[PDB]
Amino acid sequence: SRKTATELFEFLDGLGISHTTKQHEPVFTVAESQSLRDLIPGGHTKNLFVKDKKDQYFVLTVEENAVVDLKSVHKTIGAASRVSFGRPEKMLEYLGVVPGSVTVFGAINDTARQVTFVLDSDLLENELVNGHPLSNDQTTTIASKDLIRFLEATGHAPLVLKVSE
């Protein structure tokens, strides 16, 4: 069963992870999305859901303005081939999210631990990081060190690697 935002917050509370959240209308355009980010301190995350030819799945979580070279990233992350995008059926199955609502907090839904989470080194140089708490009408801030603790608590030992250009 996919978790709700409330269930995510409760899980963070049980872990002793502090969080704050802004409620907002979902945003879509380039200027409106940026305008919203600029009101919310911290690194804002974006996620690449990918796989290799052996059907090993990864989420690469990077800062919003970072660029990943999809032709080469496999070599950094230990993938079996050049990566391909993961299709939505496995994205739903594993992370409980749909396109437009992808979030690193989706780790909580991957109870079979099919996804390897990679966190970009530069992203974690931010004191605070942001993602949607399983809903796109909220943005939640946690400490970057607590993102690691969150992932570990869901059974996902993250790889911290430089995947951004």
Added chain:
Amino acid sequence: NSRKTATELFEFLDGLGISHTTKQHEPVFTVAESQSLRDLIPGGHTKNLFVKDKKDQYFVLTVEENAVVDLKSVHKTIGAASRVSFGRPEKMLEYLGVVPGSVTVFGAINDTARQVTFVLDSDLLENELVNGHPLSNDQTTTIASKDLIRFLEATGHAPLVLKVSE
């Protein structure tokens, strides 16, 4: 309000003598799927910021997909009256004939009242070729960067070519 079809756009470009090529594709939404698609399509890929100032002067800033615009300062570069604010969907549809998820520099063809000032980032125009959705997000169309300027001019939009990216 004008809301032309992709066909109408192509015919307009044909009458201008602007060569175009288009890739048909399912619409893409995720980060990796969008990037994978861009990597198959040569040229600079465009993204657009639809903004206004306190005097309700509207602008479209068209930049390369991986560029960043400093929204706190860009008004000084483009000659706006104040720090800019995002343009809301009503006016975006009224002027450009586009909705969220389908914003495109080709929407200039819909701005028949010429309410929007188009600004092209100078770095973007160093690409020989540039890409945008031809008024539909299941296609991506490539034209020469100099032809993007010709297209804008033809629609009655003299573009400002300025460094608006960081």
